[PDB]
Amino acid sequence: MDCSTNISPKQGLDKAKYFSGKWYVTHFLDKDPQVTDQYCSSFTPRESDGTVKEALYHYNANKKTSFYNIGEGKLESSGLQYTAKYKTVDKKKAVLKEADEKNSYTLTVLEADDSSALVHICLREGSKDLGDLYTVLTHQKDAEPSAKVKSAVTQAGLQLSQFVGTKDLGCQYDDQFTSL
Ligand code: HEM
Structure with a gap:
């Protein structure tokens, strides 16, 4: 599997709209799933002087x-786009497995407004593309995505109906973890 190629950040996006609150994934489009278990996700992205740091939560619905x-x-010169290395941590943010030089994800912000966002994520290990995901984001669980973000899905060449809606998965979130 190869990550989707025609992906660059929307120019003109306000980073204050993206690096704010927390995000919950309402809809995901997984090209070629790594495993067959389905997941819910929430995360809290913050930025300072070009460096992004984000607390990330996954719930296995199965x-x-x-x-x-x-x-x-670090943010690329293109706009709201970054390649992140990542640590694993426990629910109290104690570090378990450290970040390395071969495992990373690249996140590209396709749209972001006051309530909603559309991002694309390419997960890699070494020379291998492992995950390719588009995710529609909102700031509260089960909030409706904005018309502007729905337009962005259609503008990305995609059909929103072909995404998996997470509402039906019985998602549980740890909001203590994603605070900060
Ligand atoms: C509902 C949306 C999402 C789904 C369905 C999803 C799905 C997956 C799956 C199936 C894996 C492999 C897990 C396993 O090995 O059992 C994974 C790993 C991972 N995902 Fe997600 N993901 C979502 C959102 C995100 C987001 C928004 C980010 C980053 C902001 C992200 C970053 C990562 C990272 C870093 C890993 C590797 C974790 C590790 O191995 O320690 N994912 N994801």
Whole structure:
């Protein structure tokens, strides 16, 4: 599998709209899933002087367990786009497995407004592309994505109906973890 190629950040995006609040994934489009378990996700991205740091939460909807990461990377000159290396952590943010030089994800912000966002994520290990995901984001669980973000999905060449809606997965979130 190869990550989607026609991906660059929307120029003109306000970083104050993206690096704010927390995000919950309402809809995801996974090209070629790594495993067949389905996940819910929430995360809290912040930026300072070109360096992004984000607390990341995954809930496995099949097994009903959850895992935690902290990503860190630098913003590209293109706009709201960054490649992050990542640590695994426990629910209290104690570090377990350190970040390395071969595992990374590249996140590209396709749209972002006061309530909603559309991002693309390419997860890699070494020379291998492992995950390719588009995610529609909102600031509260089960909030409706804005018309502007729905337009962005259609502008990305995609069909929103072909995404998996997470509402039906029975997602559980750890909002203590994603605070800060
Ligand atoms: C609902 C949306 C999402 C789904 C369905 C999803 C799905 C997945 C899956 C299936 C894996 C492999 C897990 C396993 O090995 O069992 C994974 C790993 C990972 N994802 Fe997500 N993901 C989502 C959102 C995100 C977002 C928004 C980010 C970053 C902001 C992200 C970053 C990562 C990272 C860093 C890993 C590797 C974690 C590790 O191995 O320690 N994912 N994702």
